[PDB]
Amino acid sequence: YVHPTDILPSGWPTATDLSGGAQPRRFEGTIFDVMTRGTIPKELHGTFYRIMPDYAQPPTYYKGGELNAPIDGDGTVAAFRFKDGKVDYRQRFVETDRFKVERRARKSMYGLYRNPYTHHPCVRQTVESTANTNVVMHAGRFLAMKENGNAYEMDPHTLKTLGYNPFNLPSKTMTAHPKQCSVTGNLVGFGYEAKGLATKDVYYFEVDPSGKVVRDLWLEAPWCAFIHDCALTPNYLVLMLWPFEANLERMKAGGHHWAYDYTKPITWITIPRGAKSKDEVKYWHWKNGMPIHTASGFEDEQGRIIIDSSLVHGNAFPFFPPDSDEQKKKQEADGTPKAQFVRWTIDPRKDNNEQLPDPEVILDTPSEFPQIDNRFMGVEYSSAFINVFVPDRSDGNKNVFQGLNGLAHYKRKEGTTEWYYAGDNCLIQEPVFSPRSKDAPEGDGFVLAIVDRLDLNRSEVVVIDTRDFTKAVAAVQLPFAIRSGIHGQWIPGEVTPDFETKGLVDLPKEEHWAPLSQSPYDPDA
Ligand SMILES: COc1cc(C=O)ccc1O
Ligand SMILES: [Fe+2]
């Protein structure tokens, strides 16, 4: 009933990812010609890169790792490269300064999320990023990102780490949610806590297609807020502030970086693109809640900023609770918050001191990890591909990151939603979209996502044709499970350096090792 070796002690603390799963994976390597079921679309020409937290060492430095968060673990990138119907896989850890210290020491040397006062003395003045949140290919460079530092660059074929801060941003941080403008090609983004721990400074930038900062601006947030995501429109970058606040004194006392604050309203910072002065920036507010990710934004015909996001009516990261006893009690009392997918209207003609209108409910179901058709980034878009709790086939009492068992294809223009169910005893992660061809209509093509086959100890990539969103056309079947991850991206072959000549796996040499004379076969025999 109980295996004798299973009661042998482990030295690992519980190291969850956002799904709640706690199994360390940590493998680095490849599979050539990954097993597939069904037919891989020949139209897929590119790489699905996904990034996951997977603590490389047992994170036992601070309080035995008891307070490690699911967003903390060392970033590892899995790449699934599709070319002529074949799929290869490669996975590798980002060689962050943190990872390198810990691997070389064979020992955890970092404490609480974003709290250097809980790191090992010898590493306090390192970049503490685990580069584990998102990836982007911009100006021919492949980047792994986490918002508490600049990006690390990796080779897109070998996933070897190449360097830190490739665009030489002057801020200490860069968002893991920069947006690649479909008009200018600019990577548009920001970094908050731009001058160090608990600073209110925010740095806005646009890095052009050549890898140079062409526009930037220093500004501040109204408080030191957790600014995870943003929305790009033709004329604005819009920052989205979560109701957490940082407190240096709390950190110095060995407490968490962030504490949720029920008294903070959701706040937006509009930054006119190419603004010459921080006087052009405006703060907008609604009410308390946690809008985790934007799908995208645009400006309507009358110049209003329209942004769709998830909206959790409470704290989706309960592991960063409020400071006060009163607010802590409220978090416990609230239980699992209501979660939806909503649409915000920020009309720049209006007085920003006036509270924003209530957002419109788009999907009345827990919704997270939305993506769009990237051909429409920073302009009007219609398609969103959304990770969802499937209506009437999902728990509801699970934390928003822990019960995502379907995908939705929402089309604003048609006002339709189509649904993909991951399967019984399955979870599914964030979707990515590949257009059927360069000039396919918006949202016409293939959606890919990682499925956890929970009873099988394996992970799979499903491929869905948008012409029938309810059905997978193919599954890429790994021989094992990988961590449940955060973001991933469909990166077209056309924007990947040497995609035509380099695979994820280098071919062995042509020349035989052995001489002809060693063959068992003789054509004369
Ligand atoms: C995986 O790292 C993070 C993830 C998030 C939300 O998904 C916010 C901050 C992080 O550092
Ligand atoms: Fe994110």
**If you write DSSP's letter for every residue of 184-251 in order, what string do you get?**
T--EEEEEESTTSTT--EEEEEEE-TTS-EEEEEEEE-SSSEEEEEEEE-SSEEEEEEEEEEE-HHHH
Angstrom distance (rounded) from CA 11 to CA 59: 10
Q: Is 177 one of the annotated binding-site residues? A: yes
Name the H helices within 118-200: none
The structure's method of determination equals X-ray
Q: Is 228 one of the annotated binding-site residues? A: yes
Ligand 1 midpoint to CA 144 (Å): 13
Chain CA centroid to CA 363, Å: 21
Cβ of 146 below 6 Å from ligand 1: yes
460 sits in which H/E element: strand 458-465
- Which protein residue's CA is at the shortest distance from atom 5 of ligand 1? 71
**Hey, what's the torsion of the CAs at 331, 337, 341, 345, to 10 degrees?**
-40
Q: Is 313 one of the annotated binding-site residues? A: no
Q: Which residues contact 54 (CB under 8 A, 6 or more apart)?
A: 17, 24, 25, 26, 73, 74, 75, 76, 93, 483
- Which protein residue's CA is at the shortest distance from atom 2 of ligand 1? 71
Q: Is 120 one of the annotated binding-site residues? A: no
- What Å resolution does this PDB entry report? 1.7
Residue 70 CA, closest ligand 1 atom number:
1
Q: Which residues pair with 307 in a beta bridge?
A: 297, 344
**Number of Cβ atoms within 10 Å of the Cβ of 361:** 12
- Which protein residue's CA is at the shortest distance from atom 3 of ligand 1? 71
Of 78, 63, 62, 171, residue with least CA distance to 132: 78
**Hey, what's the torsion of the CAs at 477, 481, 486, 491, to 10 degrees?**
-30
Cβ of 229 below 6 Å from ligand 1: no
CA atoms within 13 A on the CB side of 307: 29
Angstrom distance (rounded) from CA 191 to CA 172: 8
Relative to the alpha carbon of 173, which ligand is closest? 1
Write the DSSP symbol of residue 350.
S
Ligand 2 midpoint to CA 147 (Å): 9
Ligand 2 midpoint to CA 132 (Å): 10
Ligand 2 midpoint to CA 178 (Å): 10
Vertex 498, ends 497 and 500: CA angle to 5°? 130
Cβ of 149 below 6 Å from ligand 1: no
**Hey, what's the torsion of the CAs at 257, 261, 265, 270, to 10 degrees?**
0
Q: Burial letters for 298-332: b for 16+ Cβ neighbours within 10 Å, e otherwise?
A: bbeeeebbbbbbbbbebbbbbbbbbeeeebeebbe
Relative to the alpha carbon of 72, which ligand is closest? 1
- Ligand 1 site-directed mutation target among 17, 19, 94, 146, most atoms within 8 Å of CB: 146
Cβ of 171 below 6 Å from ligand 1: no
- Calculate the alpha carbon distances from 405 to 366, 394, 523 in Å: 10, 7, 59
Vertex 179, ends 70 and 503: CA angle to 5°? 75
Cβ of 228 below 6 Å from ligand 1: yes
- Ligand 1 site-directed mutation target among 228, 319, 404, most atoms within 8 Å of CB: 228
Angstrom distance (rounded) from CA 66 to CA 220: 34
Cβ of 405 below 6 Å from ligand 1: no
- Ligand 1 site-directed mutation target among 54, 174, 486, most atoms within 8 Å of CB: 486
- Calculate the alpha carbon distances from 57 to 26, 61, 241, 275, 350 in Å: 9, 10, 32, 44, 51
Cβ of 180 below 6 Å from ligand 1: no
Greatest alpha-carbon pair distance for the chain in Å reads 94
Cβ of 430 below 6 Å from ligand 1: no
- Which protein residue's CA is at the shortest distance from atom 10 of ligand 1? 71
Relative to the alpha carbon of 176, which ligand is closest? 2
